[PDB]
Amino acid sequence: RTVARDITLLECVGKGRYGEVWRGSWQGENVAVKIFSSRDEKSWFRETELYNTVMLRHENILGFIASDMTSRHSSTQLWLITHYHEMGSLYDYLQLTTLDTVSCLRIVLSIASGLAHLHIEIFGGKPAIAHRDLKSKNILVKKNGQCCIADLGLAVMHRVGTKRYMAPEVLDETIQVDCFDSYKRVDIWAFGLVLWEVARRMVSNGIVEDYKPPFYDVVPNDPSFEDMRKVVCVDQQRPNIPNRWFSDPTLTSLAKLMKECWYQNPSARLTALRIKKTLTKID
Ligand SMILES: COc1cc(-c2cncc(-c3ccc(C4CCN(C)CC4)cc3)c2C)cc(OC)c1OC
Ligand SMILES: COc1cc(-c2cncc(-c3ccc(C4CCN(C)CC4)cc3)c2C)cc(OC)c1OC
Ligand SMILES: COc1cc(-c2cncc(-c3ccc(C4CCN(C)CC4)cc3)c2C)cc(OC)c1OC
């Protein structure tokens, strides 16, 4: 039998320290092809090892297709091939798009659904998984209005995370590194920041905030580890909740939820399953 492995790389949709992502075509169908830099080779190995352990299949997890290693003259070429989401990342989407109540809730409940699926151990199943780099650039928007979580290059089963999204216990090096629940709680902190990024873009009473990344008003454009530690750990700052949210029942409920993701004490933070339950009882 013929094994068609040719992928036509059509356009670069992402370039960074990690390498590149391309829209490609296989057998008439869009795929996304991540080509790894030498800097980020260990992310290909980690994600490949995870999918070799458990073939994750969930509507709110970016769909795996293949891991490819190809011998070249004096290098190894590493590709991760996934489903393609033409709307691009949540970060991208929120820059020009505003949201209504329905769209805002659909986005954040879909993210909580993906994250709870990663976190939960299933017997008979899947190991529990912590993401370790959850942020709006690692979430894709689907045409049906739900999102999916991407990039399991730093994931742990039972490179550092993006500094702007690091929890206080990562910044102050108190994280209990021999407790898997510690890594779930770091993801919940980051989830609360993503929830703040999305809620800002939800219109109420003709008002919306501009897209900004978390802590935009208190750290530099490219913040250092120390910059983040001083804000989050020493001064114990949290993202601003605008007054206009307290006129809107949805944004009032979302402000309470994000506060419960941002406790200094990691064991006080909500679980992903509790976040799901709370979201299903809003609006
Ligand atoms: C090697 O590499 C790539 C392969 C493919 C691909 C292309 N056609 C057919 C296949 C296929 C799948 C499954 C079987 C089964 C049949 C039943 N039996 C119980 C075991 C074997 C056979 C063949 C594949 C996997 C695509 C690729 O890219 C999209 C590949 O490159 C990453
Ligand atoms: C990697 O990705 C894609 C792969 C394929 C693809 C191509 N040839 C054959 C297969 C296949 C056939 C049969 C079995 C099973 C059936 C039951 N039992 C007997 C065990 C063996 C498995 C696999 C597939 C799945 C198509 C895709 O898209 C349409 C893929 O997605 C891009
Ligand atoms: C976060 O990480 C990964 C993401 C992806 C991925 C999957 N579907 C679609 C995309 C994409 C497509 C198109 C645009 C643009 C095109 C220009 N227009 C003006 C706005 C939209 C952006 C993004 C990506 C980047 C795949 C990955 O692996 C193969 C990723 O890494 C795990």
172 an active-site residue?
no
Residue 85 CA neighbour count, 13 Å, CB half: 27
Which amino acid is residue 243, in one-letter code? Answer: N
Ligand nearest to the CA of 48: 3
In the annotated binding site for ATP, the residues are: 13-21, 34
Report CA(24)–ligand 3 centroid distance (Å). 11
Experimental method reported for this structure:
X-ray
Report how far residue 222's alpha carbon sits from residue 58's, in angstroms, rounded to the nearest whole number: 33
Angle, nearest 10°, between helix axes 101-119 and 249-261? Answer: 30
Resolution attained, angstroms: 1.3
CB of 65 sitting under 6 A from ligand 2: yes
**Ligand 3 pocket test, candidate residues 85, 95, 143, most atoms within 8 A of CB:** 85
Question: Would you list the domain boundaries of the chain?
Answer: 1-86, 87-283
Q: How far is the CA of 94 from the centre of ligand 3 (A)?
A: 15
Residue 54 dihedral angles phi and psi, to the nearest 5°: -145, 125
The amino acid sitting at 166 is M
Nearest atom (ligand 2) to Cα of 26: 32
Q: Do residues 197 and 94 lie in contact, with contact meaning Cβ atoms separated by under 8 Å?
A: yes
Q: State how far the Cα of 38 lies from the Cα of 79, in Å rounded to an integer.
A: 12
- Which among 232, 247, 263, 103 is positioned nearest to 164, based on CA atoms? 232
How far is residue 201's CA from residue 44's CA, in Å, rounded to a whole number? 33
